[PDB]
Amino acid sequence: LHKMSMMAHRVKVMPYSTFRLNLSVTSPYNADFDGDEMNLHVPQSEETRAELSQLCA
Amino acid sequence: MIIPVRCFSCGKVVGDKWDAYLRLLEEGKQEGDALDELKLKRYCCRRMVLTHVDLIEKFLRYNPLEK
Amino acid sequence: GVKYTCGACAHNFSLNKSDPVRCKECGHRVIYKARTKRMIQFDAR
Amino acid sequence: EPKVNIINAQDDEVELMLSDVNLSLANSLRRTMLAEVPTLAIDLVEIKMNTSVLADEFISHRLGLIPLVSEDVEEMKYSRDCTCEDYCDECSVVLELSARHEGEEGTTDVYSSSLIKVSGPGNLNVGEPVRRDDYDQGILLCKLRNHQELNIRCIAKKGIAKEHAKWSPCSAIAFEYDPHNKLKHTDFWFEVDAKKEWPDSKYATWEEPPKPGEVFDYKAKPNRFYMTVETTGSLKANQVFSRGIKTLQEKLANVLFELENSR
Amino acid sequence: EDSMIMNQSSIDRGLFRSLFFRSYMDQEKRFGISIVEEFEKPTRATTLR
Amino acid sequence: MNAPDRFELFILPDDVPKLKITPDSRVPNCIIIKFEREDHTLANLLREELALYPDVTFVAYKVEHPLFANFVMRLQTEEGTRPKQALERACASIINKLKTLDHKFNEEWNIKN
Amino acid sequence: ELAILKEERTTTPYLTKYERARILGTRALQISMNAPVLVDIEGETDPLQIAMKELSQRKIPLVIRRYLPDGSYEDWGCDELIVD
RNA sequence: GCUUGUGCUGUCUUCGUCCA
Ligand SMILES: [Mg+2]
Ligand SMILES: [Zn+2]
Ligand SMILES: [Zn+2]
Ligand SMILES: [Zn+2]
């Protein structure tokens, strides 16, 4: 619904099959942990990584 | 299906008390009194025997597939 | 070469990839393959 | 300085009182007895035939949870620490169960007493499934009708409850201190009066209730701890307590050895 | 946020453990008078793709 | 599918040391100890033993994440004493306490049986 | 014609966030494709961190061409734009 | 003397999941 529904995070590799979030970012995503699912997109270039880390973080 | 070996919450062995429980219920004891006689004090263990449904008796009524 | 089992009378027999799929003795149309001979192991957990 | 007082004693449960020890020491002892005392339990199941109505992994899980005698398990070795090929007599115990229903009517029950020890360590008291009496049948494993047979070969190995709860020697450890709440470690929820809305502890008569004119003592610490250790039969209660103490000592000695070797 | 904590020892003792079954189906189709599919073990020599 | 092996909670890898000590230069005479394949059972025992020593001015521990079996301890002592010596004294003292506790328990069990 | 003389440049003298992101990305890509570095790197290895270090010291050899709506443009050097 | 093979349908319908 708004531009805070897509934000750039930093990866931490962890066991088990879920994505893990700090609980303070659940408000802009309007998400809870009763079955929700979220998508993840990997940048493929240096320029695109810089754009994500300097604009959408 | 069949009585669990251990209590889920604490792990007390409850799998050796099913037949004695049925015997005590046959003799006319109340369920609480029967559980008291079997020395199941914590209600976590009492839940395991009080709420078990024996489904294996229904599964055994179908004819065996190999002889 | 391969063992089977009848779905009705639980009779064991064999097929050679040329017979009709039927029970020999009771003529049921439903048969099941027999369990393998490879070793089967579980971790008891 | 530490003192031990035993209230009730049995093969499968002991009720004791610990005094002049820290709360952390008592809690660590409880945790060690719950999760770190080694026992013996079935870990590998080879199924040669199973025509019952129960799935293979169902029966394997049930077999894993059967308590075996673990008195001499300290002399056994861990399977990953044994240099042997496959499993040997110094790191495993082999049990075998063979059950069948004879006749065309009725049902046969498969109990844990039908497990037969085939091999294991020489002269060590390990491997046999636990039984309350000589006439006790044990834990119900499966049920068989006509033409249904169960034929398995199990391997019992040494482990701890950190890896899987089947290796836990204890079921539940009651633990409690300060029955009269003199240390004010808890704040009692109430509707009208906290005193008459909360049941008295079972050790409330072991300590003197506080005087009405007494003022709060801020210098006091928890000093007396009441605990009951219940075992599954794989070990006796005193054995569990002693081996918990020994396990804690070994962990501390390993820390000390690492410290001295660090130089 | 509606998460829950479960006991791992309870899970080890069989709490909420379950069995899962899935079935697959296949059959031999008839395309012509003599063109029939066959159930057999394929071989890289005689079989393509 | 992504579940780690249960023996990883207590089995130490060959390349992973059991104990790593680094100084904390912010305050004098402080070290940071990293314990591998350990949990609250040893941490709380060591912390509350060390907290009663007169020459120990700071002691704390934290388990960063429950999915990883490790904890980190911070220890600060007086000028005269070194923190490692205090840790060794704490380990020896708890071992002695457990030894006399086991002795008294065996004595009482033999008495009551 | 379309170029605007350096004396009459009327756009902002500060580096915007979009220009900063694009310049960092382009410089990081060039560094990762073996372009000479103009600052002394102590132990840095990541191209983006080296690009950020170059930006902080005003050593990025790139020019930003800002386009006006009518079609004209102004050329600004990365070393003469103020960066926060 | 003997060498390891290299990919996938379409179109509807229904039942569901998380928001709204
Ligand atoms: Mg939701
Ligand atoms: Zn229980
Ligand atoms: Zn037949
Ligand atoms: Zn061996």
DSSP character at residue D131? -
- Can you give the distance from the CA of residue A40 to the C1' of nucleotide H10 in angstroms? 30
Q: Residue D28's closest CA among D184, D225, D217, D204?
A: D225
Instruction: Locate all alpha helices (DSSP H) within chain E, ordered by sequence.
Output: 8-13
Cα–Cα distance between D61 and D88 in angstroms, integer?
Answer: 23
Ligand 4 center to A3 CA (angstroms): 62
The CATH class of D39-165 is mainly beta
Contact (Cβ atoms closer than 8 angstroms) between residue D179 and residue D222 = no
- F61 - beta bridge partners? F73
Contact (Cβ atoms closer than 8 angstroms) between residue D68 and residue F77 = no
Ligand 3 center to D104 CA (angstroms): 19
CB contact A15 to F (< 8 Å): yes
Ligand number, closest to the Cα atom of D92: 4
Cα–Cα distance between B30 and B17 in angstroms, integer?
Answer: 16
Q: Residue E17's closest CA among B1, A23, C13, D33?
A: B1
The residue lying closest to nucleotide H18, measuring its CA against C1', is A36
Contact (Cβ atoms closer than 8 angstroms) between residue B55 and residue D177 = no
The answer to whether the C-beta of A30 is closer than 7 A to strand H is: yes
Ligand 3 center to D52 CA (angstroms): 20
- Taking the alpha carbons at both ends of chain A, their separation in whole angstroms is 18
Q: Residue D41's closest CA among A41, B13, E27, G62?
A: B13
Cα–Cα distance between B8 and E14 in angstroms, integer?
Answer: 7
**Two tokens at D207?**
């300590």
The domain segmentation of chain D, as residue ranges, is 1-38+166-263, 39-165
Inter-chain Cβ pairs, chain A and chain E, closer than 8 A? 10
Burial D247-256 (b: 16+ CB within 10 A, else e): bbbebbeebb
Which domains does chain F show, CATH number per domain? 1-113 (3.30.1360.10)
Burial A19-45 (b: 16+ CB within 10 A, else e): eeeeeeeeeeeebeeeeeeeeeeeeee
Contact (Cβ atoms closer than 8 angstroms) between residue D58 and residue D176 = no
Please give the residue of chain E at the shortest CA–CA distance from B13.
Answer: E13
Instruction: Locate all alpha helices (DSSP H) within B1-67, ordered by sequence.
Output: 18-27, 31-37, 43-50, 56-59
* Angle of CA points A40, A44, A49, to nearest 5°: 80
Cα–Cα distance between D79 and D156 in angstroms, integer?
Answer: 10
Cβ contact (<8 Å) for F41 and D21?
no
E strand spans, C1-45:
2-6, 12-15, 31-33, 41-42
Ligand 1 center to A7 CA (angstroms): 19
Smallest Cβ–Cβ distance between B64 and the set D140, D147, D171 belongs to: D147
Binding residue positions of C for Zn(2+): 6, 9, 23, 25-26
Question: How many angstroms is the resolution?
Answer: 3.6
User: Alpha-carbon torsion D86, D89, D90, D95, what sign?
Assistant: positive
DSSP string, D246-260: HHHHHHHHHHHHHHH
| Strand H bases within 7 angstroms of protein beta carbons | 5, 8, 17-20
Contact (Cβ atoms closer than 8 angstroms) between residue D169 and residue D176 = no
Binding residue positions of A for Mg(2+): 32, 34, 36
Give the sheet arrangement for strand D224-231, strand by strand: D3-9, D13-19, D224-231, D170-177
Ligand 2 center to D203 CA (angstroms): 22
**SS3 state of residue A39:** coil
- Residues, CB-to-ion distance under 5 Å, ligand 3: C 6, 8-9, 11, 23, 26, 28
Compute CA distances B32 → B28, B43, D185, G1, whole Å: 12, 11, 35, 99
Which domains does chain C show, CATH number per domain? 1-45 (2.20.28.30)
Domain count for chain B: 1
Q: Which helix (H) or strand (E) holds F25?
A: none
CB contact C43 to D (< 8 Å): yes
D and C interact (at least 3 Cβ pairs within 8 A)? yes
**Class of residue F67 by CB neighbours under 10 A (exposed 0-12, middle 13-18, buried 19+):** exposed
The answer to whether the C-beta of A2 is closer than 7 A to strand H is: no
Q: CA of D61, closest CA in chain E: separation in Å?
A: 8
G35: domain CATH number? 3.90.940.10
CB contact F2 to A (< 8 Å): yes
The helices-and-strands tally (H runs, E runs) of chain G is 2, 2
Contact (Cβ atoms closer than 8 angstroms) between residue A18 and residue G2 = no
Longest dimension (CA), chain G: 46
Compute CA distances D145 → A23, B56, D94, D183, whole Å: 55, 11, 27, 61
Sequence length of chain C is 45
Cβ contact (<8 Å) for B59 and D53?
yes
Compute CA distances A33 → A15, D211, D250, E3, whole Å: 18, 50, 42, 6
Domain range for residue B60?
1-66
Nucleotide nearest to E2 (CA to C1'): H18
Compute CA distances F25 → B7, D10, F22, F30, whole Å: 52, 55, 9, 7
Contact (Cβ atoms closer than 8 angstroms) between residue G51 and residue G38 = no
CATH architecture, range D1-38+166-263 = 2-Layer Sandwich (3.30)
CB contact C10 to B (< 8 Å): yes
Cβ contact (<8 Å) for D46 and C41?
yes
Of the residues A25, A34, A38, the best mutation for testing chain E's interface (the one with the most E CB atoms within 10 Å of its CB) is A34
Q: Which helix (H) or strand (E) holds D39?
A: strand D39-50
> What residues have CB less than 8 Å from F61, skipping those under 6 apart?
F43, F44, F46, F47, F71, F72, F73, F74
Pairing type for strands F70-77 and F56-62 reads antiparallel
What method did the depositors use to determine the structure? cryo-EM
Domain count for chain G: 1
Q: Annotated active-site positions of E, please?
A: 2
B36: domain CATH number? 1.10.10.60
- D96 - beta bridge partners? D116, D153
DSSP character at residue D201? P
**Two tokens at A42?**
């990997």
Cα–Cα distance between D140 and B52 in angstroms, integer?
Answer: 14
The answer to whether the C-beta of A32 is closer than 7 A to strand H is: yes
Q: With contacts defined as CB-CB under 8 Å, which chain D residues touch B60?
A: 53, 107, 143, 145
Inter-chain Cβ pairs, chain D and chain E, closer than 8 A? 15
- Can you give the distance from the CA of residue E6 to the C1' of nucleotide H20 in angstroms? 31
Cα–Cα distance between G42 and G47 in angstroms, integer?
Answer: 13
The answer to whether the C-beta of A34 is closer than 7 A to strand H is: yes
